Design a protein around this ligand. Sequence first.
Ligand SMILES: [Mg+2]
Ligand SMILES: [Mg+2]
Ligand SMILES: [Mg+2]
Ligand SMILES: [Mg+2]
Ligand SMILES: [Mg+2]
Ligand SMILES: [Mg+2]
Ligand SMILES: [Mg+2]
Ligand SMILES: [Mg+2]
Ligand SMILES: [Mg+2]
Ligand SMILES: [Mg+2]
Ligand SMILES: [Mg+2]
Ligand SMILES: [Mg+2]
Ligand SMILES: [Mg+2]
Lengths: 159, 58, 169, 292
Amino acid sequence: GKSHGYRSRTRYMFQRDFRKHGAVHLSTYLKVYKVGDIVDIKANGSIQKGMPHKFYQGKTGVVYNVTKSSVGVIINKMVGNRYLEKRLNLRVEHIKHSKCRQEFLERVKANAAKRAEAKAQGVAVQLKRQPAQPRESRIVSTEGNVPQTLAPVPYETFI
Amino acid sequence: AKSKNHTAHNQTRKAHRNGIKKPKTYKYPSLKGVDPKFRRNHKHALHGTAKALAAAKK
Amino acid sequence: QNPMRDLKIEKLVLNISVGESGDRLTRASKVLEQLSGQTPVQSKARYTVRTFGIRRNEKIAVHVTVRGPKAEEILERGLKVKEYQLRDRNFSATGNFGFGIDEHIDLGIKYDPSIGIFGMDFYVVMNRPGARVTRRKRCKGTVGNSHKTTKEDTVSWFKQKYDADVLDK
Amino acid sequence: DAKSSAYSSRFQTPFRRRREGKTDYYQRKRLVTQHKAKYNTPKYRLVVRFTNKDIICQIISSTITGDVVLAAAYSHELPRYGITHGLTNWAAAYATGLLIARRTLQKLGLDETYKGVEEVEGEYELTEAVEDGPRPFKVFLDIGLQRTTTGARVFGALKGASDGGLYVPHSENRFPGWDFETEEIDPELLRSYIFGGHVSQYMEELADDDEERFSELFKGYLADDIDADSLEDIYTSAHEAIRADPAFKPTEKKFTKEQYAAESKKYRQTKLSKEERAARVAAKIAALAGQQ
RNA sequence: AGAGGUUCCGGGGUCACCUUGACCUAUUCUCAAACUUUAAAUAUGUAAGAAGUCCUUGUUACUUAAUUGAACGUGGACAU
RNA sequence: GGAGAACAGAAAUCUCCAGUAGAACAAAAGGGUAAAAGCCCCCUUGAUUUUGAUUUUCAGUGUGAAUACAAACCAUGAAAG
RNA sequence: GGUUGCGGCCAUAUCUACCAGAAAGCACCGUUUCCCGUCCGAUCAACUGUAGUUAAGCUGGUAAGAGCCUGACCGAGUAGUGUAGUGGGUGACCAUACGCGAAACUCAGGUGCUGCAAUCU
Ligand SMILES: [Mg+2]
Ligand SMILES: [Mg+2]
Ligand SMILES: [Mg+2]
Ligand SMILES: [Mg+2]
Ligand SMILES: [Mg+2]
Ligand SMILES: [Mg+2]
Ligand SMILES: [Mg+2]
Ligand SMILES: [Mg+2]
Ligand SMILES: [Mg+2]
Ligand SMILES: [Mg+2]
Ligand SMILES: [Mg+2]
Ligand SMILES: [Mg+2]
Ligand SMILES: [Mg+2]
């Protein structure tokens, strides 16, 4: 018989992360979630109320609703040939903020500061990120660094 | 009569024939599922804001 | 060495294990009640043996816990039965000790009905001051190594006052 | 003793204060967690702790970096209000709670409104809200680890903080004077406990039973001639002494903290370094195996 | 797979002994789809902004001890 | 598990120490849980009313099960909850 | 800098053995009329900071300590793996090309950091 329950195939994944079992520390409850905050979903297996489904662990969504002990998260789910919006009522033990968005807002603050500094001057700023450019020309010195290496090694066995 | 039971062959190809569509996000999302205590207040906050803007504009 | 490194009795716990309930164990409660001046508490059997005659949750024992000077008073009244003699055993490796007497002999007899003979177990729990630190709720710590009661310390405290000796027949 | 390396490897410690036996985290989560739609609103608790020879009342909110104290009052500054003896008794707990309530209210600017129970009668009075005004300062009681008994003096600080003007939500059935048999309170017994009636009756009974115990206990009362019927006058005078100026004058400290540090550093052992640790190991090898 | 550790823990042999099993301790050889401290590669979620950012302050019957926040805004600034 | 206590030992109850869970949580197996979710005690009926929203199987139908709220009304507790 | 109360991260904090602690704090400690709770004022409750003590808790230090944490061109670009070939090989498997890349091990270092408030030669 096929078994397809709500917590099927969740043996290792709602597991409680060796030597970090037990109580949930208080900063989880002390974080503040507002509507529009982007949050990662990672289900705490010790807290059984308000758990997400096993599909939604690892998924990242936008908070749409904030309640007494939970937040509502919108997750796009690929169903067939399209995505569907999934509204999730998850207690805040299974939710943490997205550090990608945290560093994005620090990048927004940095971009605003650099544009304000370039407006204090008269120069352009060129404030887009650029990829890893190819390396420029070098002059590798040899003083103390004479190029010294030999050939491949023979086959010895050392069993 | 014995035959093929289930396969997911060709399903991703058919899924990507007409693309995989993202759900077309909007400004002003629906307040379906948002807290009713927030909704009842927000209706009145919006009504008072529009009233005050009409009074300040006329 | 210090006045707070002094071995003192916490409790003398007095145990009568009677492998049946009802009338005989109410007599066993009566003798501990009149001996100690406190009502005793009864103990149910943990499991069923069928050879000891006991069943689960059957109240097959009584015991009482006496603290303060009243435990010291029953200590001599039990040790005269033992002729102020104990053994190389009877002393725990944790520093507690205890023995067993019969007849609860004569000291403070009541109206004395047709009860019969009731032997009993005396067990004396020894420590030093500062033993609250494992018993209190807040900051429930552990007594350090120099302050822990040992078998040598409690047998030296016994071969001191009460003037007794051990291992001698 | 002598645990295996597998035991020490797989051992998971409790946090630090569960190890120390100071904090109930099961109580703390419930006491600190706010309604998430009350987004950054702090949740203040009246921490009431009883050491030997002190009573600590604090108003504490919580951040991720740590707890934050808004106003704190101790029973050892009750000498400046007049109470010099029995600083851990039920009445000193009441006066410490009243002190932190008045101090907190004039800190927030909320003391002219919400005067609280001025004339104290031992009635179960919970602080009500002024209509078309600011609401009373809601503060939840945090007793920590100590047990709730009918008449425990942490409910003394509960009663004192509620009487000072804080809305501290409680029920009347842990105060002294509650009967187990009937669901009614004794306001006169509670009012005696407020003004130290239970100490005064024992003072007037020890002198009549055995003067030796009345010389052991209450030696400080006979030292400066505090008669047993003036306890109510002392606590009464101290209550409006508290109410007239709860502003927290601090001590002069009679030294500076740099001198304190420089003088307490002379008795703090300093950790050794790699070089003298290795020198100790090598000299241990040489001495213990220098052919005796 | 050998080493070290004395016992009416039913080794027969002092009536404390070559011919002691388990157990304990430090080692040792080899493993696990339904074992695990770890832990990839490939596959996988989200973000990379005008529906944005900052400043001022309007509404509310929500929320706060308190225009304190929340949500939506007005007005202003920022479009190689 | 170790050390002790007349009958009492392999195992009856009593006492101490070690004890990260090697126990228990109705029932499979997996997950979870130590001032607890286990054991014992006290109070109790929220195993109640009404209506939306959500999740999983899904066609994003039904049924089942569950989640977070909202208006009540209660229980509990000193209270937060 | 010590200490307390409330903590954040939850072993660099735990565990074992030993030693030290001035001041204050904390603690043990003293009492049982009241509130309260026990078989037992041991715990819990109350009262006195009074009779005493740093013995313990607590804090710090020591250990070629166990554990834990961090780092390393240490193992090791090894194992595994994505991609490629009308590559090798009877096969099992393997080498190569473009990539990603561990773990155990072995060494070295470390052994709580800190927030609010109060107090202390
Ligand atoms: Mg399955
Ligand atoms: Mg995992
Ligand atoms: Mg077919
Ligand atoms: Mg509690
Ligand atoms: Mg497999
Ligand atoms: Mg079960
Ligand atoms: Mg499990
Ligand atoms: Mg509980
Ligand atoms: Mg079903
Ligand atoms: Mg006592
Ligand atoms: Mg107490
Ligand atoms: Mg080490
Ligand atoms: Mg250390």
